[PDB]
Coordinates of C-alpha atoms (C1' of nucleotides) in Angstrom, one line a residue:
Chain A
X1 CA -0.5 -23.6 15.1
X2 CA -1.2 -20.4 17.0
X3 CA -0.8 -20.9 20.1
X4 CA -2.7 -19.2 22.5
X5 CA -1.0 -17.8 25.3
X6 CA 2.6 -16.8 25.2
X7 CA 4.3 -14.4 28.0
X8 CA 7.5 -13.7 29.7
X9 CA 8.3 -11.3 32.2
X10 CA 11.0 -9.3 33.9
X11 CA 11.7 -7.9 37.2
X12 CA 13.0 -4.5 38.1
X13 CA 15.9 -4.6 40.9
X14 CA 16.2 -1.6 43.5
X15 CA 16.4 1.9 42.6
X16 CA 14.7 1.4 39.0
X17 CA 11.9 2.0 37.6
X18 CA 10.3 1.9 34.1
X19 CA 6.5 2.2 33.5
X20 CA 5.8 1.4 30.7
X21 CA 2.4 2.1 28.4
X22 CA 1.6 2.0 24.1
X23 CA 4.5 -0.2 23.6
X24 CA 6.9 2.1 24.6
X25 CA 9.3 1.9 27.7
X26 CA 10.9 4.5 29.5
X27 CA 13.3 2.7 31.7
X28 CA 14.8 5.1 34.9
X29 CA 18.3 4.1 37.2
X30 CA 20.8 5.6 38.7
X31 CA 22.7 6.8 35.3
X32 CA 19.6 7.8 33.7
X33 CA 16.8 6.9 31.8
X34 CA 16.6 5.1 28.6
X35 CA 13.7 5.3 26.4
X36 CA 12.4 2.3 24.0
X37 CA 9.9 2.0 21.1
X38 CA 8.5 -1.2 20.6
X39 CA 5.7 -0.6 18.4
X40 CA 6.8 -2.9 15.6
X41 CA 5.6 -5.4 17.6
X42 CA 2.1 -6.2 18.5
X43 CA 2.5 -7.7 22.0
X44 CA 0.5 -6.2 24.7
X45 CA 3.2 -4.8 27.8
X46 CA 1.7 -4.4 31.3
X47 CA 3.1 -3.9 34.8
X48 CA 2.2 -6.8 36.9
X49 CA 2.4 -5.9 40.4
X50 CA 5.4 -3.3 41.4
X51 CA 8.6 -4.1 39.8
X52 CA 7.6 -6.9 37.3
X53 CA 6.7 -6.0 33.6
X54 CA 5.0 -9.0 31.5
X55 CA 5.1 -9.0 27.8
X56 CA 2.4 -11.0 26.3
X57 CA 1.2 -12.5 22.7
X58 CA -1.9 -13.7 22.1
X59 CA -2.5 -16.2 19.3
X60 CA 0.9 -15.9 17.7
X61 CA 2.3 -17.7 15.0
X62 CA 6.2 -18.9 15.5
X63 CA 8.0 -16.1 14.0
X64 CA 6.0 -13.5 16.5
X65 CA 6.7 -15.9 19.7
X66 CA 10.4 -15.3 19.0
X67 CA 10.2 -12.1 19.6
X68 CA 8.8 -11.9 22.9
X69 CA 12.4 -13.2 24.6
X70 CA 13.6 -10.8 22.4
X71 CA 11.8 -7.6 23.7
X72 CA 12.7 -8.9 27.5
X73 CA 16.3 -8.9 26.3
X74 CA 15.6 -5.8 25.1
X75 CA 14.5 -4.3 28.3
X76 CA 17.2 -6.5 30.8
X77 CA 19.7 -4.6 28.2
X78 CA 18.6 -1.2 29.5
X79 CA 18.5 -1.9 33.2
X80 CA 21.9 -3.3 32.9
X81 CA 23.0 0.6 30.9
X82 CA 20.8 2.6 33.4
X83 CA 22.7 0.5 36.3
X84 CA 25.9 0.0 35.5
X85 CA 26.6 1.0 32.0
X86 CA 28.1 -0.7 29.1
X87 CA 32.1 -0.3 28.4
X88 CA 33.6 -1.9 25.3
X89 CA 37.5 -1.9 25.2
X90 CA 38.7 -2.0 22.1
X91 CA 42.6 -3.3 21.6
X92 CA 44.8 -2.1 18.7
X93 CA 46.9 -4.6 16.7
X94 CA 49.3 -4.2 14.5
X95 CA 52.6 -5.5 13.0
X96 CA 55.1 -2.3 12.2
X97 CA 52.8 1.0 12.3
X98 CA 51.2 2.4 15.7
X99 CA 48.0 2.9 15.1
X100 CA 47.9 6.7 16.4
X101 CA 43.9 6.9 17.6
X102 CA 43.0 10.5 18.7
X103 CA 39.4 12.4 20.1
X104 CA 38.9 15.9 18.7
X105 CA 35.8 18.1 18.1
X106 CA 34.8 18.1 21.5
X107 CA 35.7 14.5 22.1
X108 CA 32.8 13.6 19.5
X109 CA 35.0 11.9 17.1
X110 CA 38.0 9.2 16.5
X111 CA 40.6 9.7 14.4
X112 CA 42.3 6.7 13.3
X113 CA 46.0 7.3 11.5
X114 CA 48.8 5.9 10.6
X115 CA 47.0 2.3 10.1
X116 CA 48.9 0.1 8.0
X117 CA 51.2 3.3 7.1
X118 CA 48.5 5.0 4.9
X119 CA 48.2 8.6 5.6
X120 CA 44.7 8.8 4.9
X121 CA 42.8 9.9 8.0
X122 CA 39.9 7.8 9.4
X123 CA 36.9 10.2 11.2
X124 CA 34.7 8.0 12.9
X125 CA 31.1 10.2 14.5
X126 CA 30.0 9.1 18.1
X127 CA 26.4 9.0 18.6
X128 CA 25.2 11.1 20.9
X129 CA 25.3 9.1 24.8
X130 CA 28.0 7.8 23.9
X131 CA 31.8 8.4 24.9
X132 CA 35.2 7.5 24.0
X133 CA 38.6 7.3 26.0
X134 CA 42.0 6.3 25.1
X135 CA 43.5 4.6 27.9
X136 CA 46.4 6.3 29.1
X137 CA 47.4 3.1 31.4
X138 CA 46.8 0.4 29.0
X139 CA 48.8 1.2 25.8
X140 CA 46.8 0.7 22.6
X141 CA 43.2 0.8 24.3
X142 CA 40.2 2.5 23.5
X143 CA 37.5 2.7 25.5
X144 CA 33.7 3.2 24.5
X145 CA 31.2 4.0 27.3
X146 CA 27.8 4.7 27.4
X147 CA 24.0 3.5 28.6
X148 CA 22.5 2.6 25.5
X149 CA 24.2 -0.7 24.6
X150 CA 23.0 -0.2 20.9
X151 CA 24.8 2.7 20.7
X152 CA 27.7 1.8 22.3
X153 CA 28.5 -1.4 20.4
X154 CA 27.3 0.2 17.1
X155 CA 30.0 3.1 17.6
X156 CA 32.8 0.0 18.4
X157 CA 31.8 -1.8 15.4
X158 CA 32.3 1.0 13.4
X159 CA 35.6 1.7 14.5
X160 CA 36.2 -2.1 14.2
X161 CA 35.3 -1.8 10.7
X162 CA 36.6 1.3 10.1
X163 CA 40.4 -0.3 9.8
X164 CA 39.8 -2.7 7.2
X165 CA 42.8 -4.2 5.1
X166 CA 42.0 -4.2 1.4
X167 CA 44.0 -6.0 -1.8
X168 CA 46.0 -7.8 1.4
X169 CA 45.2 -11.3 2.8
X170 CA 43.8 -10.8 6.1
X171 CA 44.6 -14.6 6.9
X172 CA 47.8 -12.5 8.3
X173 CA 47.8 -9.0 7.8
X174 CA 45.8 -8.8 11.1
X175 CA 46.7 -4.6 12.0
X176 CA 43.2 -2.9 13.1
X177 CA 41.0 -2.2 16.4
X178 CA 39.5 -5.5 17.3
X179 CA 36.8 -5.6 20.1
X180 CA 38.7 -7.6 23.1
X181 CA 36.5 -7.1 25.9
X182 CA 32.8 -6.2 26.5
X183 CA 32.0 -5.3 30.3
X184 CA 30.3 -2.5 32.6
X185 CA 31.0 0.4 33.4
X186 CA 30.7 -0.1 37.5
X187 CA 32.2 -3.3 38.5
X188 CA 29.8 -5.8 38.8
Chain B
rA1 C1' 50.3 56.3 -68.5
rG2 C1' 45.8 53.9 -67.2
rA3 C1' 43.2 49.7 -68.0
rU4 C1' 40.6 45.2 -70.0
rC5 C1' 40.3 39.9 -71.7
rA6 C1' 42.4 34.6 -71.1
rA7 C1' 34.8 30.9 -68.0
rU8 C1' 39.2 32.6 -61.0
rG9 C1' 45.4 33.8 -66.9
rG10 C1' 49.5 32.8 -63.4
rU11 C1' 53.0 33.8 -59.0
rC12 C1' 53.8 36.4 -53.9
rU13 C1' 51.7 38.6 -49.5
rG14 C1' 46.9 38.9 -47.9
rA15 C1' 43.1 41.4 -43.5
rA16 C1' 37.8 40.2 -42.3
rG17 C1' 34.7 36.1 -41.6
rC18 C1' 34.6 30.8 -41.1
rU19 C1' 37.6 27.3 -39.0
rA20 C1' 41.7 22.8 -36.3
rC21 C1' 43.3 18.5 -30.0
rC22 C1' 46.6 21.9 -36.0
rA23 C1' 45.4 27.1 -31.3
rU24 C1' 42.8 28.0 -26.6
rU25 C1' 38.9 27.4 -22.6
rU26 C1' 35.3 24.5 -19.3
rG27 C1' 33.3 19.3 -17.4
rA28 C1' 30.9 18.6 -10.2
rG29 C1' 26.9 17.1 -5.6
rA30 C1' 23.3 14.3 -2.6
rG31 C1' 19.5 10.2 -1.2
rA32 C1' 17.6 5.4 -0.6
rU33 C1' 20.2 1.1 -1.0
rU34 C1' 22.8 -4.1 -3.9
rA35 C1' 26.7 -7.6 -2.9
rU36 C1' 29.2 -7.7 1.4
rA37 C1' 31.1 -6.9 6.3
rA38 C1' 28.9 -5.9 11.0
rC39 C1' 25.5 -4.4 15.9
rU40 C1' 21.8 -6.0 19.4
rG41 C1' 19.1 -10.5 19.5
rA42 C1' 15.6 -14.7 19.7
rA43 C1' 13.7 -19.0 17.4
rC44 C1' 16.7 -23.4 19.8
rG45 C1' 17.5 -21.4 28.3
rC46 C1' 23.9 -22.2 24.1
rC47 C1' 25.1 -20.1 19.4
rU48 C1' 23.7 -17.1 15.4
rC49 C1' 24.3 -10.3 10.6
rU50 C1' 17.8 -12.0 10.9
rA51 C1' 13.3 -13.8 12.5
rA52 C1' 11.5 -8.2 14.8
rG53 C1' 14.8 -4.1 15.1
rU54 C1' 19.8 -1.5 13.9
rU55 C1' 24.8 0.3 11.3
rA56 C1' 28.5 1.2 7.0
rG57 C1' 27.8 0.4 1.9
rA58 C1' 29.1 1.0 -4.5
rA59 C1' 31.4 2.8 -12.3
rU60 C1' 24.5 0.4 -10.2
rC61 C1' 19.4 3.1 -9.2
rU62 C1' 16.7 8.0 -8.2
rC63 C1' 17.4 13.1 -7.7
rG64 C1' 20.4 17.6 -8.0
rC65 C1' 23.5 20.6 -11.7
rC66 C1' 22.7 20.8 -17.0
rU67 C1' 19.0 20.8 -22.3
rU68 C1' 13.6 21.1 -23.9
rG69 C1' 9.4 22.8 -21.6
rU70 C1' 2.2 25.2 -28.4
rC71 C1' 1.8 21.4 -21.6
rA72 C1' -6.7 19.7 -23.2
rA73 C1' -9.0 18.6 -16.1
rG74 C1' -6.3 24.5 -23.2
rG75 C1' -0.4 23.4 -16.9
rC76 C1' 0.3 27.4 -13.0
rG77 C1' 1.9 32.7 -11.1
rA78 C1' 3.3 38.0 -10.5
rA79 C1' 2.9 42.5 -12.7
rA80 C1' 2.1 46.8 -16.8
rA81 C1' -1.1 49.3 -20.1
rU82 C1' -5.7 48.6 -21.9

RNA sequence: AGAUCAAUGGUCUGAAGCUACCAUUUGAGAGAUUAUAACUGAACGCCUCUAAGUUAGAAUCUCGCCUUGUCAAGGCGAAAAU
């Protein structure tokens, strides 16, 4: 069945803004603005009014309904980075060997050594918007902040993934940088 | 003394050329991705790597490097003398 009708909206709080036109989004807060491309997606986007934004499908099958949530999601996700941010702290474990995690080239990349004992060295790229901090308080945090919540977990999963035990059951050989905690930057 | 013949008379050494892992020299890079592990995220007001969208990803695959390139819309240029 295609049902004919299908929208959802969302609203905009103070001190935001995001006109939107062509399927493409150009969210605007305090930290920012955050830029989105919808177009795989043939929903018609409209502002309703002053701070609301309705995303609509006409005559959509299930598959295309399920993305509607998805896009407003989507767009909640960058009023939440252009407000307050997105901060993932990161937590290293391990049984014998520090895991020594450094910044270099301009703080632009991590540098993962000592994990497990290897002495190979583990280079892992932030994208750009994106930052990284080692907690000098909290020993054995990392910290990855930025607006763009894609970006930001996409650079902790690949640390996350970067230490990776191999030949070793990981049912206890648990060493590596584990997500613990995914927050804002500004407390909310 | 010089040489000849014995279908290469025979023995020793034997350059040159040819030749031996029997000597010596040289042999390497990207791209898209599979399985897989993940991100954000609905469907299904919760969850979820998946549905839309995103990451990393290999003796595989494609390309580069390397060999041929008398190629029938007779494959296509530059340039010289005619």
């Amino acid at each position: 069945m295609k049902l004919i009708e299908s929208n959802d909206t969302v609203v905009f709080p103070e001190g935001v803004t995001f006109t939107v036109k062509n399927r493409i989004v150009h969210v605007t807060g305090p930290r920012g603005t955050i830029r989105k491309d919808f177009r795989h997606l043939h929903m018609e986007m409209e502002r309703i009014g002053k701070s609301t934004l309705r995303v609509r499908k006409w005559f959509g099958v299930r598959k295309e309904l399920a993305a509607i949530r998805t896009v407003c999601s989507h767009i909640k996700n960058m009023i939440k980075g252009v407000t307050v941010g997105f901060r993932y702290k990161m937590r290293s474990v391990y049984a014998h060997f520090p895991i020594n995690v450094t910044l270099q080239d301009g703080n632009r990349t991590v540098e993962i050594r000592n994990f497990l004992g290897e002495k190979i060295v583990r280079r892992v790229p932030l994208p750009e918007g994106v930052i990284a901090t080692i907690s000098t308080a909290q020993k054995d945090e990392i910290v990855v902040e930025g607006n763009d919540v894609q970006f930001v977990s996409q650079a902790a999963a690949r640390i996350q993934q970067s230490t990776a035990v191999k030949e070793k059951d990981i049912r206890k050989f648990l060493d590596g940088i584990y997500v613990s905690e995914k927050t804002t930057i500004v407390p909310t």
